[PDB]
């Protein structure tokens, strides 16, 4: 548990502000690390990998992909879906 | 050669385009299925597969994803990336 957290939670913001994160844990020696997004920001959750990949030349692999979904829950208890990406990557 | 082509690749038209696409696919007997996008249209891909596997309740599942770039050539020989998904389904 003492060891930096290896989640990338990418969301709104512009996407090399998730790249830098990802690569600040690189040079922490964290050497696996989970980039995970929901909906819109799927796509740049991807992106972030992707540039990451590049940006870090050593070699980044992509070691496990899940899709899924999660239920958002409203104010008035209706419930709705969401997308969710998780990728897992590997120096 | 000769069965119904297995891939939906998805672009900018609405997400229900897409899952029309490939519910039809499922019902002419096509059981295994491939989801392309890139770009943007990587969060439709994701949301796609995730609202066909409930309208076709059929139990459909992520056979296997697979992330990457690819290079896009401009009219003057420039290139950049773009990132790209595909994702299998099957029945």
Redesign the interface.
């Known amino acids: 548990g003492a060891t930096p957290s290896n989640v990338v939670l990418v969301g709104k913001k512009p996407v090399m502000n998730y790249v830098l994160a990802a690569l600040t844990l690189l040079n922490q020696g964290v050497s696996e690390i989970t980039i995970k997004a929901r ?5 740049k959750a ?2 972030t ?2 540039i990451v ?2 940006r870090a030349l050593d070699k980044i692999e ?1 070691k496990e ?5 999660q239920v958002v829950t409203s104010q008035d208890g209706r419930q709705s ?1 969401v ?1 969710t ?1 998780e ?1 897992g990557i590997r120096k």
């Open positions: 909906g819109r920001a799927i796509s991807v992106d990998v992707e990949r590049n992509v992909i899940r899709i899924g979904s879906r997308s990406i990728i």
